[PDB]
């Protein structure tokens, strides 16, 4: 893989992973600074959902920087690397993100669940689709994972954008600027899954865990960073309970 074997245990991507644990170590502290000085009531629930996301992340990075979680998956000849963590930190942290976003679309609470519902599944079918033992399941899975993936995205441009429009331009500007990155950023995701190791096999473990770095990197501390400096923010919420 390319990279460079920094524990010297033969794994190269452990550079990228290491980059990754930094990175996310410093947003956390980062929002956990700011987020001291922040009164307001709506501002400390954005904070705290917030503050987890690149936390969480660190603790996983952490993990699979030093190889907690790291096995191998037979496919035919092959023995394909798997990290649980990765997959642990998704299924946290992208429900939390997508909390954000509710939280700004002020929807109710079916709709929340429905939304990390399908956002779960696709996490679980993606880590199904990582540790299956044929090229065939494999591409299978990651298929339904993708179609849950454009179920949540679809919900997120329609119904809660909408939502968002009715509580006027500083809450409408900020759920749209975040928006507009989740669908790209998210989308990412699956594309490097099929290009890389785990799908056609283009693209090696190194370039692959790179490129999850900093789409994670970009997905969690960008996003919170875009997020928490907007007066949006200040705004009422409802949490889902
Ligand atoms: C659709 C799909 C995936 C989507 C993962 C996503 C969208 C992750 C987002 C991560 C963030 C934003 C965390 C920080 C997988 C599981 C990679 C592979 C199977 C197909
Ligand atoms: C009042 C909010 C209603 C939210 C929508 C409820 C019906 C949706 C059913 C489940 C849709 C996701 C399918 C799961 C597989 C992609
Ligand atoms: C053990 C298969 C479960 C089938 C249940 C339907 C789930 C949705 C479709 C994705 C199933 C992928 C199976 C791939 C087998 C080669
Ligand atoms: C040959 C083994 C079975 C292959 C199963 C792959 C399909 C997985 C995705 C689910 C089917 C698409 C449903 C379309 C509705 C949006
Ligand atoms: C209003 C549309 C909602 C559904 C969107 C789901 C798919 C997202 C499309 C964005 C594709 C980005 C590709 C980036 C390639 C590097
Ligand atoms: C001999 C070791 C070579 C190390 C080369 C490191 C390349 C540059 C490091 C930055 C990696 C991308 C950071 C992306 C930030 C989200
Ligand atoms: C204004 C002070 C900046 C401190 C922010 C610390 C976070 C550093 C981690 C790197 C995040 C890069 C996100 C990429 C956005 C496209
Ligand atoms: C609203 C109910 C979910 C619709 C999902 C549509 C996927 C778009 C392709
Ligand atoms: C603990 C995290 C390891 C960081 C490695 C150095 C990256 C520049
Ligand atoms: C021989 C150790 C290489 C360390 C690379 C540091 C990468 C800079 C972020
Ligand atoms: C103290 C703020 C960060 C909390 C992150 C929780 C997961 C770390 C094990
Ligand atoms: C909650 C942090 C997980 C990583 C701990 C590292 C253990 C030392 C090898
Ligand atoms: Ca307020
Ligand atoms: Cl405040
Ligand atoms: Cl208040
Ligand atoms: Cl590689
Ligand atoms: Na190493």
Redesign the pocket.
Known sequence: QAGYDLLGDGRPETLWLGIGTLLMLIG?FYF?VRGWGVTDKDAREYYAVT??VP??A??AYLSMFFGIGLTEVTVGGEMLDIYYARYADWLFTTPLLLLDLALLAKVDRVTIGTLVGVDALMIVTGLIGALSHTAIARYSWWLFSTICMIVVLYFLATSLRSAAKERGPEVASTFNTLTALVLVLWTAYPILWIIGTEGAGVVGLGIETLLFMVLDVTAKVGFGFILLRSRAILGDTEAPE
């Open positions: 956390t956990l503050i987890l936390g969480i660190s603790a």
